[PDB]
Amino acid sequence: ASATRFIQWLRNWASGRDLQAKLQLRYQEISKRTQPPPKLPVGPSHKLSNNYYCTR
Amino acid sequence: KTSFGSLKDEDRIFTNLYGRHDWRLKGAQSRGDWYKTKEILLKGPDWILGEVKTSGLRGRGGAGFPTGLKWSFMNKPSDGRPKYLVVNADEGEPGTCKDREIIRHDPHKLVEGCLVGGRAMGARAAYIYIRGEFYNEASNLQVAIREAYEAGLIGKNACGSGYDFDVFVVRGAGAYICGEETALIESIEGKQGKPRLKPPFPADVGVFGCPTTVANVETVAVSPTICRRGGAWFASFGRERNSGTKLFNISGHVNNPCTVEEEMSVPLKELIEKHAGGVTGGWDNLLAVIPGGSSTPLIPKSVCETVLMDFDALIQAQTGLGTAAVIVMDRSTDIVKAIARLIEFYKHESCGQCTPCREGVDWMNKVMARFVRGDARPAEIDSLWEISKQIEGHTICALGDGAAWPVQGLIRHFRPELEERMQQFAQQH
Ligand SMILES: Cc1cc2nc3c(=O)[nH]c(=O)nc-3n(C[C@H](O)[C@H](O)[C@H](O)COP(=O)(O)O)c2cc1C
Ligand code: SF4
């Protein structure tokens, strides 16, 4: 991210691409390393009736 | 006949139901008891069983099984064991108090019924199992039995017929389950009142391991009159397969709760207003009725409008006649709390022997307690329905069924009340 403008032009010209738009090094676009807690769903057998195991 | 329920006094069987005449031997004889008892005994068991059959009498203990056919299981050659009649006077079904009146006001009808019913079965003695709370009632019965012994009506050469018959009175110690026929027998034998599996049936292996018939007090007490007046007379009351007269207990929210004898198949509304003085606050204030003791499902007002009181009619109404103990609930009743208390009753009475009732009934009681407060979710109603179906038909005895049915009745007719309570509780929390 911190390359000088001249160096950006040189490696863009040498590679023939716009490297700056798809840098292989990750910066702040990635997800936070602390996330809010999940609340995961339950499957279709989580029922209080009409759920006899011999039918599934 | 299409209408039933204007029974005349001359057609009534328990003519001292209210204890306004001498309940002792002199009064009982003056009212027709013990009359021509020798002739009945000399006719033979087949004649007596024939009369009981043609009367269409059915069990008055709550299950309504044909009495004549049931009593015929005992008509067989002796195999060396004594034969016994056990008369069920345990009277534990909530709402039911009919057998209490017979025992204390018409004891000699019960004693004579024991001799006549015992003769047909070939029994040597009758054991009358009366609940232990009925202490004064039991003492009246013992006084009457002593009178019959001293007049030769029972004992050796009963009524001069050459038939030896003894009548014993055995008191319980406080267990509703001991009304169940096999639990009653185990109780007489000095064990816990825990029912037996069937087979063997009591007519083969019963009290003390001997051939036995268990009969309700009311079923026994009417047998002498059916023999004297004939089965055809009895069968002229009520619908086909619903014959005879019946003792009814009308308790709950009625102006004049009472016990009364009325014809089988009388309309429920006709019974409540002709005898009990109507519903408290009028017929429009009626919410629901338990038509046959705590074990029969409740029915709402709409069904109560035209339902008849007999085994077939109430079955079609998705309930049962049971003991014919009518409990009335008006619109001011907390219907959920009323049924929950019955489930609490069955929780206290379950003998604990078998898994679905020992665990299931206590489970149903816990769920009903939360349903009273609304502290549940609507999905739990179908869960509770399914739980009750896992108890019904999977237990040793019918107490498990008698606990499931009241729950099923409430969900059947009062689901929106259950769901409304849940909404209130959720809205307030
Ligand atoms: C929990 C339970 C309690 C019962 N209590 C009585 C009772 O108190 N009196 C009675 O006659 N039958 C009672 N029964 C029914 C008896 O098991 C039996 O069916 C009846 O006494 C048979 O007599 P019957 O054919 O003359 O009705 C009870 C059944 C159960 C399952
Ligand atoms: S159903 Fe209940 S009362 Fe009947 S045997 Fe089982 S545990 Fe005992």
Query: How many Å lie between the centroid of ligand 2 and the Cα of residue B196?
Result: 10
Report yes or no: B202 and B232 within 8 Å, Cβ to Cβ.
no
- Span B25-236: which CATH code? 3.40.50.11540
Ligand positioned closest to the Cα atom of B52: 1
Q: Is B127 annotated as a binding residue?
A: no
CA distances from B120 to B38, B41, B49, B72, B78 (A): 13, 8, 6, 8, 13
Q: Show Cβ contacts of residue B16 under 8 Å, excluding neighbours closer than 6 positions.
A: B23, B27, B28, B31, B105, B106
Nearest to B252 by CA among B287, B297, B221, B228: B287
Contact A50 B380 (CB under 8 A): no
Element (H, E) at B325: strand B325-330
Contact A50 B382 (CB under 8 A): yes
A49 close to B (CB below 8 A): yes
Chain-centre distance for alpha carbon B138? 18
- Residue for token pair 């050796």: B156
- Residue for token pair 């086909």: B240
What's the rounded Cα separation, in Å, for the pair B250 and B266? Answer: 14
Ligand 2 atom with minimal separation from the B397 CA: 4
Ligand positioned closest to the Cα atom of B396: 2
Q: Which residues of B touch A50 (CB under 8 A)?
A: 382, 386
Nearest to B36 by CA among B161, B149, B130: B161
Length of chain A equals: 56
The interaxial angle of helices B399-427 and B379-391, nearest 10 deg, is 170
Nearest to B304 by CA among B274, B334, B335, B326: B326
Contact A48 B379 (CB under 8 A): yes
Contact A48 B382 (CB under 8 A): yes
Mutate to test the interface with B, among A42, A46, A47, A49 (most CBs of B within 10 A): A49
What's the rounded Cα separation, in Å, for the pair B126 and B153? Answer: 14
User: Any alpha helices (H) in B3-44, and if so which ranges?
Assistant: 25-30, 37-43
What's the rounded Cα separation, in Å, for the pair B114 and B40? Answer: 13
DSSP annotation of B262 reads E
User: Any alpha helices (H) in B198-260, and if so which ranges?
Assistant: 217-229, 231-235
Residue B347 burial by Cβ neighbours in a 10 Å radius (0-12, 13-18, 19+): middle
What's the rounded Cα separation, in Å, for the pair B205 and B237? Answer: 35
DSSP annotation of B169 reads E
Q: Which residues of B touch A47 (CB under 8 A)?
A: 379
